[PDB]
Design a protein around this ligand. Sequence first.
Ligand code: CU
Ligand code: CU
Ligand code: CU
Ligand code: CU
Ligand code: CU
Ligand code: CU
Lengths: 333, 333, 333
Amino acid sequence: DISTLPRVKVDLVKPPFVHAHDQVAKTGPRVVEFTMTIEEKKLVIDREGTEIHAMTFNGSVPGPLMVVHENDYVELRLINPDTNTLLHNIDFHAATGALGGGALTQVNPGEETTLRFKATKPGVFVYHCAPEGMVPWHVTSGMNGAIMVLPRDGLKDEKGQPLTYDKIYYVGEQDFYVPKDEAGNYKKYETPGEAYEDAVKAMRTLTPTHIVFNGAVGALTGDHALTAAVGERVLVVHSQANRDTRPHLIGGHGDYVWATGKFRNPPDLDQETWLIPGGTAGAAFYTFRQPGVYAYVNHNLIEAFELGAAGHFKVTGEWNDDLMTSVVKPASM
Amino acid sequence: DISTLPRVKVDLVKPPFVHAHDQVAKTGPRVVEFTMTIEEKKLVIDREGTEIHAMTFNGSVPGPLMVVHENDYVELRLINPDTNTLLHNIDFHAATGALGGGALTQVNPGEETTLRFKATKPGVFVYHCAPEGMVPWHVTSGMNGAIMVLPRDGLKDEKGQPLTYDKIYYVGEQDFYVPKDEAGNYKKYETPGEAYEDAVKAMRTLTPTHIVFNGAVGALTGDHALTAAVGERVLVVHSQANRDTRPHLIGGHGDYVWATGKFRNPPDLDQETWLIPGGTAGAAFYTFRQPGVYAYVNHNLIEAFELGAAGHFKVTGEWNDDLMTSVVKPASM
Amino acid sequence: DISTLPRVKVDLVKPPFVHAHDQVAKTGPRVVEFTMTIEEKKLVIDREGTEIHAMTFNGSVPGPLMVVHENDYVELRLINPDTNTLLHNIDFHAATGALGGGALTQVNPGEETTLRFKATKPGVFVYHCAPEGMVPWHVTSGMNGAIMVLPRDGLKDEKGQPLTYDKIYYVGEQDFYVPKDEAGNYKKYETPGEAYEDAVKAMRTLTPTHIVFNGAVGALTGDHALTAAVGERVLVVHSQANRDTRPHLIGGHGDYVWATGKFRNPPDLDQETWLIPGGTAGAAFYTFRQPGVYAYVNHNLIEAFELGAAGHFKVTGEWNDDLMTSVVKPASM
Ligand SMILES: [Cu+2]
Ligand SMILES: [Cu+2]
Ligand SMILES: [Cu+2]
Ligand SMILES: [Cu+2]
Ligand SMILES: [Cu+2]
Ligand SMILES: [Cu+2]
């Protein structure tokens, strides 16, 4: 049966970008093959040069977004090069059985493995590393991403009418717990293992030191702001593998939102802010109507503006005065 | 076009009360004009006399609830008197473009401005001050409120049948982060700026020192409890501009609840407790069936009973023994 | 009227098990009688022997799950034996009036009382102790449980088709705040009152020291793991009386989920993780398709793996290679 199915190999791209795919399936079920290489590496996460030992899927935080269609088979080749120091694995919330695949994918440095699973449920799901005994440590070190399982006939609104996006971006939100000395300065370590004991004590406080989008404070700002034009329909996939978040587009809305990200449910309309539970991926669809800069944020404003959970959208086009206008510009009373 | 539309000026009232309005629109689209004056002031928030420098819209925490209808134009005159010390602005989650209006409304003490925007989406939305660089500081100092955009044909249940309320109250929940000395005593400052540096360190802990309704511990209790009678339909609008909350009516329920507050979505039925994400306004409809005192609370009971997030409802009418009755009064076994 | 109704006495069972009942009602409305005895007792909650003074309904944390049908009358006999030291009461989120029954059930040691209320709304609700002035202290000491009010015609899916479970388990999640000395070691007390002053300071930090299922770290693991077989439909009721949680079945899904637990609302489909607000009970239905061990967790992984919020399911049956298969077992590259 599977033997007889067609197979296509897909090369992943770095977040916030997403690999090429079809919204409405043009072929029947296929075996979609992906390859990911584990990369343990130092990463500076803020302006002051705070550095951590990140554990990544394909060298990025978050790992890349995989896109398949309902009932396709996902075949993943997972490589943990001998240059790494730790055992890793992968658990797909999209899969059924063996702890999401975690129990079948344990690879020590120098090993690899190939897992195949059927994508039976449509929606956006989280995938993350989950080694027995050190699950939270690998997850909060950036070892998580997401997979989107699109219905074979694309997205639909509450009335069952088609929703087609022109652009799609993937925003992975990460809570970090950097160990601190007595005065409050962040510690630095030589290897991941040296950090272990302190990492556990930092996590138990339940208070992140940094909460960032795309691995660093300001990663999606300035020259890295997301782009769009007035009239474009944009799908924004957002995931949080460990902690709740409440996304919000400042100056816009979520026209159609699947906060818990499962496509068989009708979306919520006209959201100002929505809650994505830790351990979940959600998706929001919006059509831009005004040009300018928009701030995309986690709406606990301390987490957004003090801790790092803030990004930008720069949109081009003509301003619509009917929607909004400054009647009297700021001036002395 | 707008030139030709009718205009009505509306005078706002202090929370928990709401200005007069029509549920079902009796006229066509109009330009609804409001005026708000910024007021920086000292406020004692608890029983022990803890005082803070609050930043308010119209002298209240939360700012007043504005009520308009879908497709009306909101025209707001914002005044920042020379007696204030800081730059302020306003961002409406109900608006589209220019950061909700924040980029078009920056006024220094002694200035004013007039913004107009089209209320294209029905629901309850949060509005708050958001000056570049000090967003969380102004929000957590009490500078936020809410606006309700009613469908032109009023509220409806899941089956599309009319829902008419007899009374409406606005509950604004506020998380405060008062700086403390080494022993745990709250600090006091002369002006807002003197508090700044310490305020930022207090906010970064992510742990509020006070979480109150209507600006103070016990503000909606005793002689200030909300009132109703058995048989009355009450709509309770609740907003939290920065942090999640989980409202609950002790002794009652939320018969119809729009937790994320957007009216084009059908409401949830028979809720015991519901989650309102930080940065959102929600609404719950309930018909009183028993008289007596009801406690309206944030259901994290530590936040409610230790931190200040608790209010009362005193309802008049006849007791219904079918619904509830004490069969055997408390007595010695 | 009530005089003329039939009455049945029901003996409760210890969580995670649930007393015998009918899904679809076979008789008309009845008076369902229950008896609960309050038990103040020492409980060791972790591996290191940390001990607390738990306040329980029927000797368990959480208290037992009561199951009735819509429009039945619940008659509860509450006994507070002279061996206890504190005043207690009970508030049912399922009831209407008198603070959920809290104002009608205040019993000092040596007293008892009988309350009756009509179960007018279908769903799973939380019930908990709530004495004026010490509400959070009794709740976070384990004094809470849940009651399920089933529609007279059983459970239904989004299309109104019947959902019948073969097994049902009750998971009560509890956040504990154990007082600590300067070095971080947990304190020990002789009686509940001796703990009081310190308990309040510990709660105000808003950071639990332990978050457990069924009263202790590892309570639902090893020989106490929940059981099922491939093909069985299982209903998992989960409650959190004070704090938000985000349940997740590792290796599975929530096929039908009522996150806020009210049955008149259609369930959410294919959830990976769902949010249950503090002060709420929810229910998830799932059909097992793969055998093996599944971890049932609160998806804030620090709370699950470091703090104690983790349990197991051991499922028997044949492995399905179509759903998942290891193509290449872990081996040297
Ligand atoms: Cu790993
Ligand atoms: Cu997971
Ligand atoms: Cu301001
Ligand atoms: Cu905002
Ligand atoms: Cu008690
Ligand atoms: Cu309660």
